[PDB]
Structure formats: structure tokens, C-alpha cells
A paper describes a structure:
Bound Mal3 enhances the difference between α- and β-tubulin in the predominantly 13-PF Sp_tub MTs polymerized in the presence of GTP and Mal3-143. Using cryo-EM and single-particle averaging approaches, we determined the structure of these Mal3-bound GTP-Sp_tub 13-PF B-lattice MTs with a single A-lattice seam (without bound kinesin motor domain) to an overall resolution of 4.6 Å (see for example Fig. 2b), allowing generation of pseudoatomic models of S. pombe α-tubulin1 and β-tubulin, as well as the CH domain of Mal3. The overall tubulin fold is conserved within Sp_tub monomers compared to mammalian tubulin, as expected, given the 77% overall sequence identity between S. pombe α-tubulin compared to mammalian TUBA1B, and 78% identity between S. pombe β-tubulin compared to mammalian TUBB1B. Thus, when the overall configuration of the dimer is considered, the Sp_tub dimer appears to be intrinsically slightly tilted in the context of the lattice compared to Mam_tub. Thus, in comparison to the previously reported compaction of EB + Mam_tub MTs, Mal3-143 + Sp_tub adopts a more extended conformation. Our single-particle calculations show that the average angular relationship between adjacent MT segments boxed along each Mal3-143 + GTP-Sp_tub MT is ~−0.4° +/− 0.3 (median +/− s.d.) relative to the MT axis. However, docking of the EB + Mam_tub E-site structure—in which hydrolysis has occurred—into the Mal3-143 + Sp_tub EM density shows a good match with our cryo-EM density at the E-site. Together with difference density attributable to the nucleotides at each site, our structure is thus consistent with GTP hydrolysis having occurred at the Mal3-143 + Sp_tub E-site. We therefore propose that Sp_tub is intrinsically non-compactable, perhaps due to the tilted conformation of the Sp_tub dimers, thereby altering the coupling between the biochemical state of the Sp_tub dimers and MT lattice structural state.
Numbering used by the authors:
A (entry chain D): 1 to 121
B (entry chain F), C (entry chain E): 1 to 38, 49 to 444
D (entry chain J), E (entry chain A): 1 to 428
Write the structure that this text describes.
Amino acid sequence: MSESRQELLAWINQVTSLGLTRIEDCGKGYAMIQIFDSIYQDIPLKKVNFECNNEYQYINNWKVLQQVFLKKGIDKVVDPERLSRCKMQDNLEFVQWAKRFWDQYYPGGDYDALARRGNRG
Amino acid sequence: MREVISVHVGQAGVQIGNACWELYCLEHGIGPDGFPTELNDGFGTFFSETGQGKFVPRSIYVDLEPNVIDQVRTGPYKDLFHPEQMVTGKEDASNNYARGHYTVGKEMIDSVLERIRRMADNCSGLQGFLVFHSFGGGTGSGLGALLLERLNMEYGKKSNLQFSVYPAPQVSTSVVEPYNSVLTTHATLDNSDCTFMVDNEACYDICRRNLDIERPTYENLNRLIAQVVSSITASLRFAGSLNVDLNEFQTNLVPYPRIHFPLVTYSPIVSAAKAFHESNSVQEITNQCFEPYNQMVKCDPRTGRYMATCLLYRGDVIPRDVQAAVTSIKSRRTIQFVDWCPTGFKIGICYEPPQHVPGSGIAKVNRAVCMLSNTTSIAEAWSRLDHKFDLMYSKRAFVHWYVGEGMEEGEFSEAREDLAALERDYEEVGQDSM
Amino acid sequence: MREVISVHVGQAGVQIGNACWELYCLEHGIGPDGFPTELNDGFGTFFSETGQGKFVPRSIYVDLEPNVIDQVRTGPYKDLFHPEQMVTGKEDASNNYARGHYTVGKEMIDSVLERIRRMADNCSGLQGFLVFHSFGGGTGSGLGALLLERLNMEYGKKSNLQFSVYPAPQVSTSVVEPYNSVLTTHATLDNSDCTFMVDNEACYDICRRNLDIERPTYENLNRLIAQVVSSITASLRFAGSLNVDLNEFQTNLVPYPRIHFPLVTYSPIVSAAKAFHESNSVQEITNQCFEPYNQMVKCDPRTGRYMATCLLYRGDVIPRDVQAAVTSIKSRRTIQFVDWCPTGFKIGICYEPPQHVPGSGIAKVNRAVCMLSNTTSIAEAWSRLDHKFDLMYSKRAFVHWYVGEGMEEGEFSEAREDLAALERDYEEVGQDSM
Amino acid sequence: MREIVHIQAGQCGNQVGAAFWSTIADEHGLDSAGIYHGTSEAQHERLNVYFNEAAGGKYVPRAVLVDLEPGTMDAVKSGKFGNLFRPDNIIYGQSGAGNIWAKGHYTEGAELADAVLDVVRREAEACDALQGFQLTHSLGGGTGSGMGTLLLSKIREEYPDRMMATFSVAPAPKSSDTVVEPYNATLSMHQLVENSDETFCIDNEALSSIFANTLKIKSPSYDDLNHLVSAVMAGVTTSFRFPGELNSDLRKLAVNMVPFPRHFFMVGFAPLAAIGSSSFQAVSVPELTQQMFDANNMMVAADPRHGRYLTVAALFRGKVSMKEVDEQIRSVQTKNSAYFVEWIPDNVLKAVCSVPPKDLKMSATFIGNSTSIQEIFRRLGDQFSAMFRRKAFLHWYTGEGMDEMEFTEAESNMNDLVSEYQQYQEAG
Amino acid sequence: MREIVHIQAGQCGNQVGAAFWSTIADEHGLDSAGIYHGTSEAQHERLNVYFNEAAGGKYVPRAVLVDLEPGTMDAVKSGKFGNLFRPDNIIYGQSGAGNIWAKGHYTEGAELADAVLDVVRREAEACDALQGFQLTHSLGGGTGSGMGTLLLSKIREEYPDRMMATFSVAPAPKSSDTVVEPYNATLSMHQLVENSDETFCIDNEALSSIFANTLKIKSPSYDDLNHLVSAVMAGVTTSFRFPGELNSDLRKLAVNMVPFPRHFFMVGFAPLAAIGSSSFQAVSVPELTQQMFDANNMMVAADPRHGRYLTVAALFRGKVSMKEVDEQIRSVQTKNSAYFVEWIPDNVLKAVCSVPPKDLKMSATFIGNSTSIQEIFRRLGDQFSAMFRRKAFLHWYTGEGMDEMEFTEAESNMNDLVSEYQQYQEAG
Ligand SMILES: Nc1nc2c(ncn2[C@@H]2O[C@H](COP(=O)(O)OP(=O)(O)OP(=O)(O)O)[C@@H](O)[C@H]2O)c(=O)[nH]1
Ligand SMILES: Nc1nc2c(ncn2[C@@H]2O[C@H](COP(=O)(O)OP(=O)(O)OP(=O)(O)O)[C@@H](O)[C@H]2O)c(=O)[nH]1
Ligand SMILES: Nc1nc2c(ncn2[C@@H]2O[C@H](COP(=O)(O)OP(=O)(O)O)[C@@H](O)[C@H]2O)c(=O)[nH]1
Ligand SMILES: Nc1nc2c(ncn2[C@@H]2O[C@H](COP(=O)(O)OP(=O)(O)O)[C@@H](O)[C@H]2O)c(=O)[nH]1
């Protein structure tokens, strides 16, 4: 049923090709938005910042998904303030939830966002 | 002394002020006969006092009926005004713009424009002036649009605010509300600095639920609009915490000179038994002021994105409960975006508690919120008009009674055209890319 | 502040709360008008207080009759609730699942779901929420199963407890209790975290012997179920000795996500003259709580083997008399085995003495026990249903009045099928070998 | 000055403070108000251990009372002794732990760990020289069993020279609390053995035997239970915290005990009597030594007669010689010579402290080592593995973030312990 | 005698007077009535700084409270302390500023600038020797953000030797006032850097964190907010305004700090506690130093852990040694050695002042420099430029007399600052 940290961390290292040491960098993000571009392909990657370890500034980067959830319509509330704390109790069941979205919506093909964002330049 | 004057044209503009000045007299301890008193600067704010101690409400009244105006001198405020300021008209042809504009209402103007003049000859600190009319009126739509266009021709840089009221999406009061309302947004486009408009059927929709009265009247709708007035004006007439001037709105609501149609959201509006069994804290109010149940204008501000919004708070308010609330609105999905202001707010704090008139069924509260919201959706009632008004003009229905009163249809040719740029302006702001 | 909210759907769910909140108001010194007081955190547990000092019972009421709901505003608790939270329905077609689910009850949901929302906007420490309905209801079975399936769709990980009541082995209240009850365990299977259910005819069986009243009523059955509620909830709302959270149950009762139907056993329930001439020590109670005379559900828990059971004690309790008692139950033949837990218990201690309401014939006691027992026998009332429900469906009896309200019989095709896996699950746990 | 900073975790893991701290104040002559009232000048020269000095004599207890749920935390706040602890060190979360281990170890403590370590760091470097840290918690629950272990492994990853010493309480053989109490016990031991040195094991049910068998009270409560096992936390520092003739410290009580990195041993008191059983004796070291022999004066629910004594340290306080212990230890090591370990001749440690406790002329604290502490873990292990066969209650752990085979590892971790204690039961 | 003439601007720029002036009177033993009531003889020899002597002991505060709108100006007039300031220096216009910068900078202040300078000139040459000028205002508004800057550039064009020192308050990262608050911030920095030396940056939202995180009050108001950040205006002159052992001045606090003409750095207090958190400590320099380390005791909404300390000056008052600071500064500069700038070994400045404040035995004032003050301006710059892409609200500026490309220049002025702080974050 559910998945631990043990499988999921290299699982999210796979489909994003990121050097994700611990899951709490999804406390910022950079991978949850890189879940959806593996399906929807329309996400404007130049709308998010890349370094942005500055939580007061980061709150711009949560809402960029709220256009993505708008145009495809999945009704989950996103409360970014404890999400942006880079702390657990929300980030797991936000990524346990986004692999409940893993169920049917893949076309199977790869989606190289490492090549899409200009090699993270 | 940072003072401003409020004109009243149209039968709406009559009865609106009859709630506004009632609130004004109760918000300073003014007896209804003008002879008051059964802050320091407060005791002489809207009022050019005489040494007798009674004082003139700095207003004017414009109507071409003697009907509703003479109800005041019959009514209990018979000593409040003075019979120069209260200029009537002996005859009328209302619901007729282009003779209320171009034939019959123009004969009052030179009498009106003199009374604007001497009241501007005492108010040393002048902050523009305030305009009340309706769109459902003929002459208030008629003379009102004519009223601005010479005053802003005179006064140049001075401030021009107006609280309007437009014909509903569902219930009209007259058939001319396509015709002799939608053209008046021509002259008031480039003569009103900012403007505000509100719906009856939306305000009635509040009355059946938040006021819970099956059969309300105009007067209760008059009282509800009236506190929005004193939430803006008398806030600078009271020594608050972060003071908000009249001039701050017109520079904190428009990125562009056309886009000056915000919303109104006033809250808490709470019935008698509803205030009991309830604590309305400040974030309990602000979570209601973004929900459509306290919404003044029957539109869809949920769907559109918000642009920029100033807020005004009355009573006992801390800014920490503001920032704890307002950081939750910007987090929440029910707004999505501004692109052109990454903040999109203006916060203002005045200490004066919300005034509670005795007669109506509104209930007393120790904190208040007024909301002026610019959005990417408010042009749909304008698009309601374009669905309506272009259909009437697809038959040419009493163009004669726009012609025979003295104006060709070239402005009706211009009518949807300026409306089309208004629709074009919101999709222009709707452009949100790189 | 570790707070939770209780919904009330169904005419059972009406009158159940009318005993539950009565107990709640007496267990904190709350006057019946809401304005109270003729622990520290205790004085604000179930209650989002206003500064007036009276406070809202954090509940809701859902019914499609205006009949029984308006008895409250006639009744003595007329100031307790508030007339937003108490949402009624103007018309009803009850005993009809698939229009109480799919036609008529769904029109209330958007009004209901808003009132779930704002009450979740003050309760900062939220522990899921509590659900009351019946199976003997139509709409409480109907809207209730619909109520969970969007809330658990919204709230995800949040807790979902429900105290249900099912149609007896011997006395029905309606013929639809095969039909418009046994399907509702579909939606409540995968939306209720844990659940609990109880029998009238078993609870009536207690009334003729342990209460010794020939002609009881619903109200006395309402009072008996109600203390089981506060034995679970208000135990964490009081500073006990070994505190028991709501979340502890749903992790100490299910080895598997389906098996969440425990028993209820409440004791001592002792009549007026019976408390005299008697000392009910703690092991005197626990030797009764495994005997079928205080048993809430008319089944055979003797024959089946027990699985895992949490216990809750109120009042003046030592753990030594627990362990002296509980080592005798595990020795005794009247239980035989668990295979899957060689301990099979959860012990919990709260100091608050058992509250004794004045009106009914229940007697006061200085110690209390609540029992939540999982077993290998409780599926027989389910097997009673399979004996009943598959017989009605062997004739297709007003399938039209399941069809004409807007649902095909594919769920009735699914009805026994999910029931068959429930029967298959207890023999699956009945598998006890190597 | 050889000082300790104190850490609690869990509900009853916080309940032990009042039995600890009101005694150690009373052992040091100190009131409820914190301000000083002491008789002798003997109780000052090592007062600095469990106390940070304050302005105006307040003498704050260096402690951090930690929990996940605010049920029982206010109870000692709103009760008496509400002015001893400084509330900056009182931290506690609100959401329930549900006493589930990885909920308390891995995730909800991680909501509170960021506030934990910034408390103990500024406490640490404000001390002169840390002697060690105390962790008192539960094995059975979730908050004390889980959150303190993750709390421990960060501290052991910060201070590798500083000694980590822990107290904990056992699952019961019969009087168990919950059904995941097997899982919590195994998962707690996976961090205790790997990180900290020493841990002691106290059965509540064997503690319930003490007032049953010895003091003869039918109905004690937990405020008598922790009150008894308080004084061994006094007893382990009894040698230390005020002068004497010989005494050593807990690090010196660490290196003497075990010949391996595998540290668990027993706890008992001396003397001990009932209400009316007080004056009918002659309280002395032969009275002390025989209440340092039975399993009845122990705490572990395991038989030393099934076991074998690896090493013994004895901690006396009062007027006491050596030869009164010497002739008496020799009187019992001879009749029970097979009960000792023949790897070590004379595994006895003697330590004599000076002043007596309240209203008792002598007192002794028992430290004896065993082979039969595997009798816990064998009783744990088949209590553990039988609840793994059907993956009992498994979704309340893997539904939170931990791999199931990580749970299988701690079984062998328990079996790695028993494999050594298999040998020294009968070898050599 | 090394004296300062005081300048305020804007509504909240005038609100800070009462938190300033009632403290500096109380710091100098002076009542509401102006007439003298002081205990020691210690508080006179440097009393002449913020006060012009008067006839009959009145001791007028040398200040000029400046505003564009008469809303809040009468509030401190008609309230208490209405007899401290002399009303000749109370000037204020009537027409609203609309908090728009060039309306407040360029044109409406030019209605009032002619009355401004004839006030401060006759104040200046009546002083013995000016030590400097203080400007306290806002960055976000219009009156304080605009009119004081044009007011500044005339004074810096009159007194090129005299030091210009400014206090100002930041736009918030989240709790912003208005939407032109990006424009006002950029336009204010265009004059602060070019004319005056030093400016400090105080977030109200980080100030709101202080009573939230440290003092634990759910609902403070601004009269508690300015009351806290008052005492650093006391703290910067604490060294100066009455004797001590070592102390230097703000010009000596100017030349020591920055190796360039680019002057911005941080503000914090020591000590600090809650209501009930008062007596449970031992208030001392190790208590002082650790509330001179966290970002939590700072004012800037930027991380020193993201940054690097250029130079540090510390200003103590109370009975305090040096070695109690020396051993303690060395205890924290070693663990945080990468946090210092390796251009300068020992960028620490020590200054010890004598008398304590009210009811506190010690007090310290924090000055530390950073590289991460660019974290303001990067957060400003993209908050700025994104409201330039569509020329947001542009007609409320070019409709008043300023060219739009003049607004573009201040972007590079901000980017000229960041370009240096890009380097010394990681270089050398
Ligand atoms: N007096 C009044 N009018 C209202 C109110 N609310 C809405 N209205 C509108 O105000 C309009 C009143 O103007 P008229 O109906 O034309 O009455 P009138 O005297 O002819 O007004 P003029 O055309 O300006 O002369 C109506 O169309 C209504 O739609 C209200 O509360 N009071
Ligand atoms: N009110 C009440 N109902 C009880 C009680 N005990 C059992 N019930 C059952 O609760 C059911 C009540 O629901 P309904 O009979 O359908 O009354 P209703 O208003 O139509 O309820 P809905 O179908 O939910 O609308 C009955 O069938 C009883 O079997 C009780 O003590 N009080
Ligand atoms: N020390 C001590 N432990 C107890 C007592 N009573 C019960 N316990 C054990 O302490 C634990 C109490 O559970 P709890 O503290 O809630 O576990 P938590 O999740 O870590 O907080 C259980 O494992 C009990 O078996 C007591 O009086 N003293
Ligand atoms: N110093 C201070 N500033 C505040 C406070 N509250 C708000 N502010 C800021 O101060 C400014 C108040 O605006 P205002 O004084 O009218 O700007 P002005 O046009 O220069 O007068 C805004 O930028 C607010 O962000 C406060 O309590 N103290």
C-alpha cells in the first residue's frame, strides 16, 4: 500500500534526476512541480526560482502549481505555510498523495526536465 | 481642514444621503435638528459651523422632482439643511438622459454651480468632492454625468469619487436601464477619478440571509451602503493608528487610468440573534469577506483573479491578527494570482468602533472591515449590458426619444465602442505572461 | 487544542445528541442556556467560546424533516445551538437511500459542507471528527454515507469515528432495514476509520433487567449510549493517569483496515435499589463486562474468540486491581484465545467520576468501565442481514423505488459481494494455525 | 564541575520528575520555592551537578521536560512545584502521538526536534564540564520510546566523548499496557544499544510486587511507584553528589561493569520495610546485604538464580565500615559461588558514601549484572515475532514512512544480544 | 559639546518620538514637564546632547517633528507629553501625501522645504558643535520616505563634515503595507546611499516575531513595537551620553565598521525575556552573548547564517568586565569562525558603559555587519522589477514630474550595491 522513505527517495531521484539527499527539500519543492511535467508538459519552468533557500521568498513557488491544478482540476487544498517550513508532517502526505496520482495518468515516456530547464541554469 | 463635500443627484442620491447623514449625525453626537450634543478636529469635520452651534451638513441636493426632496422638510431633519443648498426642480422629464442632460436638467446647472462655489469658499482643506447618483435613474444618471464634466473641467486635479448603483442582472426598475444608464459611463469614465458600484439584488440577497428579513425596503439597503461611506470618509476624520487618506485610494487601486471599478465588501453584517452564539474575531470576518455571501455586487469574483485591494478596519484591531489572517488568504486557493503586484494589498487602521443605528435590525459589533477589491471579473456585468444594450440597439427603440430631446445617435454609435475597450482592458490585464 | 466536532444526521442522530450534549453540559458545569456555571483546558474543550461566556457546542444537525429539529428550539436548549449550524431540510423522502443519497439529500450538501468548513477554521488542534447516524434511518443512512465520502475525500488522513445503530435481530422499525441500511456499509467501509454499532433490543434487554423498568423509551436508550461517547471523548478532555487519545483506538483495534467493528460493553449499569445492598468494586464490574448481561449488541461474543480490546476506566482506579482482575479473565475459560496478539489489551485511566444525570432511573457510582471488544463472532448480525437481504433481493422488491430515485441495481449486485468478503474476513482471521 | 543535564520523554517519562526532583532537592536541602534552606555545610561542594546557579538563590533544575501531547504536561505545571522548572525548557507538541513508534520517533518528533536541540546546546556550553546526560522514558509507549531515541542519536552524534546514560521501564510479562508494546520495545532497543552505553530495565509489575511482597500495601498508586524507583537515580549519584571516603562516578561505574559494549544490569534498594515493620529490626549491613540478594528486592522480571552475576557494584551511604561489608560479602559469595562468573574473580565493587538519607541510618543501592537479562528479550522476541507472522498492525508503521524489512533488522539486533548472553550463561 | 539635532518624517516616523523621547528623558532622569528630577550626579556631564538648555530648567528636546498630513501630528500634541516639544519646531502640511514618493519627495515637500531649513539652521548654529543628525522615517510610505530624503540632500549639501546617520524601517517580506512600497523602498535607497553614511533596516514583521518568539505575547501593538526598538537609539548613544570606561561615538562607530562607502548593518538587544521568564535566569554576559547570536534576536529579515559577519561592535552597560566578554566572544568566534570575514582578523569592537538601565543589571546593544543584507534587496529587486514590466502604477509618478528612466537608474543603484555583496559573500 504505502511507501517508506527507502523506496520513494530513489524513486523520486529517478523521475526527476535530482540529487535529493533528504525528502525535506520537498519542503521547498523542486520535485513536486517536476511530478506534473512528466504528464502535462505545459508547465512554465521559468516561473519558479531555482536557488531560493529563503522561505519568505519561496511562497511564490508554491502558487505556480495553483495554475497547474487549475487547468486540470484536482481539488486538494494546499496550505503552503507549514509546507514551506522544510519540515515533515505535511510533505510526506503531500508526496504520498502525489503518487496516489501515479495510478493511471502516465503515458510511460520519459520527460527530461533536466534538459528542459536549461540544465538548471 | 481636510474637508470634502458630497453632492446628491437622483432619487437614489436623495435617499442614500438620508442614511448617510443619519449615520454622520450619530457618529459625532449631532442632534437631528442640527443643534447637537444632548474628537478635537472631529467636532468640525463635515460641517462649516456657525456660532450658533448648529451646523450645515456640507452637501447639496439635486433633483428635478419636488416630490422626494420635500419629504425631508416634512421629515424629522427639517432644520438640518438650509433652503439654498437644497436645490430642487419644478418640473421633470426623468428616464430621459438627453433632455435631463441636454434640455431640462441643464437649466438648473448655473444655479447648482453657484452652490458648489461658495461651499468651496470655506473648506480650506479641500480633498476633491463626493458624488452620489444611480444608473437606474434617468436624471441622476443624466445630470450626474453632466455634473462631473464641468466640475472636473473646473477643478482639474481635484478628487472625484462616486458610489453608484447599477441595474441588476435579474431585476430592473425600468426598461431604460439599458439605454439611459450605459451611456453615462462615457462622461463618468474620464471625469470620475475612482468610482464604485453596487447591486440591489445582491444587496437584497444579503438581506434574506445575513439580515434574514423576508420583506426589506430601500431604507435598509440605504443603511447598508451608508456605512461603507463612513468607513472610507470618517476614518480620516478620526485619529486612527495607520491613517488612510482619500487620495491614497485613487493611487492604490489603479495601475491604469481606466480600471477604476473595484468591489465593495462589507463585513460583519450580522443579524440580531446571529451575533449571539457567535464570536466574530477579525480573521472570522476576513474569511467571510472573501466568501461570496457578504458580497455587494452580484458577480463572480471567485473566478476572476484579484488585482489590488485596500482594506479598512474599524475598532479594536491589531496588525498581528491582520498578518495572521492575510497570510492565509494569499495561501488559499480561492484566490490564485496577481501578476502585477506580488503584494496586492493596502492596510489601514482606524480606532473608531462601528456605529450601530437603533432602528434597523442590524446588530452591534466591536470590530469592522471594509474591502475595496479590484479584480479580473467585474467586467461581466458590463458584459451583461453588452448582451442587453446591443440587443435594444438592434431595433432602434425610441431613438426618437433620444433624438427628439436633442442628440443624434452618434454617441450610441460610440456607446458599445467605449464599452468594447473596457472589455478589451480586462483581457489586456488578463494578459499575464512574459 | 486537541478538539473534534460531532455531526448529527438522521432522526436517531438528532435524539442521540440530545442525550450526548446534555451529558456534555453537565460534565463541565454548563447551564442549559449555554451561559454556564451557576479543568484548566477543560473549560474550553468541545466549545469555541465567545467573549460573552456562553459557547457553541461544536456540532451540526442534519435532517430533512423540520419536525424533530424544531423540537429543540421549542425545548429547553433553545439558546444552546445557533441557527446556522442547525441546518434542516424543508421536505423529505426518507427510507429512500438513493434519493436521500442521489436526489433530495444532495441539495443540502453544499450548505452542509460550508458549515463543516468554518468550524474547522477555529479548531486548531483537530482530531478528525465524529459521526452519528443510524441504519434504521433512511436519510441518516442515506446522507450519512454520503457525508463521509466527501469529507474523507477532503480531509484525507483525518480521523473518522461513528457510533451507529442497526436493525435488531428481532424487532425492526421499518421494512427497508434490509434494503436501505445494508448497502450503506459500502461507503462507510472505506470512509469510516473505525465504527461502532449497537442494538435497541439488546439495549432494551438491559432495561428490563439491569434498569428493571417495564416501559422505557428512546430517551433512556439515548442516555445509555451517550455515556459511552463521553467515556471515550471527554477522557482525553480530563487530566487522567494514563491518558487515552482518539487516535490510539484506530491503531489499537485493527490489524487490518477492514475489521473495524468492535463491541461496546458499558458497566456498571445498576438500578436504584440495586446500588444499595451492593459494593461494586472494579473487578466486580469487569467480571460483569465479560458476562452477556451488560452486553450492548444482541450477538454471541461468548462463542467467538476475542481479538483485541481496549478498556477505559473512570473515577478512582488503581492498576493493581486491574491486573488482579485482568489476569483472571485471561485465565478463565469464557475466553479462549487470541492467536495474533498474546496480550490483546489496552488499558486507560482517567480520574473523572461517572456523571449521574438526575432524571432517569440510573444510579450513581464511584467507578466506571467502558469496553471496546473486537471478536470472532460479530459478523453474525451481518450474517443475519445476509439471511435477510439476499431473500428480499430474491424477489426484486421495489427495485423501482431504488431505480426511479436514480440508481441502477449494480450496487445491489455489489451489495452481498462486499458483505461476502466481510464474512470471508472473519473466517480469514478465524484461520489460526501455522 | 562534573555536571549533568537532564532529559525526559513521554507521559510517565515526565511523571518521574517529581519523584526525582523533589527528592534531589530534599537530598540537597532545597524547598519548593527554589531558594535555599539547608542544614549542614556538607551539601554544597557538589551541588552544581543537577542545578544551574541563578540570581537570588533560585537554583534552577537543569532539565528539559519533553512530550508530544499536552495532556499530562500541564499537570505538573498547574499542580505544585510550578516554579521549579523554567518554562523555556518546557516544550511539548499538541497533536497526539497515538503511542506509535515511528509516529513518535520518525515524524512528529521531527516537527519538534528543531526546537529540541537549540535548547540543549545553549544548556550544554553554559555548563562547565558535562559529566553526562540522563534519558528517562518508556519502552512501551510512543513518545518516550520514539522521540527520545531520535533525540539521543543526534546528541550522540554531537558529543562523542560525553557519556550517555539512560533509565527506562520494561514491558510487563503479564500486566502490559498496549499491544504495540512489543514493537516499541524492540524498536527502542535498536537505538539504545547502538548509541548510548547503559540502560536499566524496570518492570512495573515487579515494582508492583515490591509493595505487595515487601511493604504490604494492597493498593499503591504510581506516585508511590515512581517514589520508590526515584531513589536509585538518587542512589547512582549518592556516591557523587556530596562527599564520602571512596566514591566513584557513573563513568567509573560504566567501565568496571561490562567486558564488552553490551550494557544492561539490575537495580535494587536497601533497606526496605513496611509501616509497622520499621522498628522491629536492627538496621545494619547484614540487614542491608540480604535485601541485596533476593530477586524480590530487584526490579527486573528475571531470575538471577536462572542467571549468573557478571559484576557487582555496591553504593552505601551512612556510617558504614568496609569489613562489615567485607565479611558479609564473603559470607554470601561463598554459598553462592556458582552464581558468580568465573571469568572474573572478585567482580565486587565497593563504594562508601557519607551522609544518611531522611530518617534512615544506612542506605544502599544495588548494581548487579546478569546473564538472564536475555529472559527479558527471549520473552520479548517470541512476543515480537508472533506479531510479525501475520504482519500485525503493520500499516500503522509503513503507513508513516519506514520499510518493513528495517523492522526485521531489529530482531537480529535483539538476537545479536542474546547470542552473547547465550554463551556466558554456561561457558568458560 | 558633541551634540545631535533630531529629525523625524512620516506618520510612524513621528510615532517613534514618544518611545524615543520618554525613554531618553527617563534615561536622563527627566519628567513629562521637562523640569529636572534626577537621582545620581552621573547623568549630567553629557546631558547637553539631545537637549537645548532652557530658562527655568525646561530642557527642551532638540527635535523637529515633520509630516505632510495633520492626522497623527495632533495626536502626540493633544495627548500627553504636549509640553515637551516647542511648537515652533512642530511643522506639518495639510494636503495629503497619498504615500506616493515623488509627491512626497519632489513636489509637496517643496511646499514645505522652505520652512524646513530655516528651522534647522538656527538650531544648528545655536548648538556648540554638532555631532550629527538623526533621520528616522519609513522606507515604505511617502512622507517619511520622500520628504526626508530631499530634506537630507540639502543638509548634506550644507554640512559636508557633519555626520549624517539614519534609522529606517523595512518593507516586509510578507506583511507589507501598500503596493507602491516596492517603489518607495528603491527610491529611498537612491538617496540614502548617495548622501548619508549609515542606515539600519528594521522589519516590522521580524519585530512582530520578537514578541511572538521571545516575549510570548499573542497581541502586541505598535506602542510596544516602537518601545522595543526605541532602546537601540538609546543603545547607540548609551556609550556616549553618560560616562564609562572606554566608550566611543557613532562616528567612531562609522569608520570601524565598513571598508568601503557602503554602510548597512544589523540591530539587536540583550537581555530580553518574558513576564514570567524574568527571574528564572542568571542575567550575565553569557546570558547576554547568546541573545547576541541568533537571527531571532535580530531585526533584519535576513539570515546571518546565509550571510557572513564583516565587523562587530558591542555596546555594554552595567557592571561588566572585559574578560567575561573576551572569553565568551572567543567561545563563539571559534565555533563560528567560518561565519566571520577573513579579510579582517578580530573585527570585534568592545565598548563598556557604566550605569544599568531601569530594573536590569546589565544591558547590551548589538551591532553586527553582514553580507546577506542583499537578501533584502534581491527580495526587493525582483519585487521591484516585476512591477516595472507593465509599468505598474507609473502614472502616479510621471504624472507628477519625474522621468521614467530616472526610476530605472535606481535599479542599477540597487544592483551596484548587490554586486559588491555578491563578492564578499564568497571571495578572498
Ligand atoms: N431612492 C432610491 N433609489 C434606489 C435605491 N436603490 C436603487 N435605486 C434605484 O434608483 C433609481 C431612482 O431613480 P429614478 O427611478 O429615475 O427616480 P427619479 O426621481 O426619476 O430619479 P432621476 O431619474 O435621477 O430623476 C431607480 O431606478 C432604482 O433602480 C434606493 O435605495 N433608494
Ligand atoms: N430518534 C431515535 N431513533 C432511533 C433510536 N434508536 C434507534 N433508532 C432508529 O433510528 C431510525 C430513525 O431514522 P428515521 O426513522 O428514518 O427517521 P427520519 O427523520 O426519517 O430519519 P432519516 O431517514 O435519516 O431522515 C429509526 O429507524 C430507528 O430504528 C433512538 O433512540 N432515537
Ligand atoms: N515510569 C512509569 N511508567 C508507567 C507508569 N504507568 C504506566 N507506565 C508505562 O509508561 C508508558 C505510559 O505510556 P505513555 O507515557 O503515554 O507512552 P508515550 O507515548 O511515550 O508518552 C506505558 O508504556 C506504560 O506501560 C508509571 O507509573 N510510571
Ligand atoms: N516605525 C513604524 N512603522 C510602521 C508601523 N506600522 C506601520 N509602519 C510602516 O510605517 C509606514 C506608515 O506609513 P506612513 O507613515 O503614512 O508613510 P508616510 O507617507 O511616509 O507618512 C508604512 O510604511 C508602514 O509599513 C509602526 O508601528 N512603526
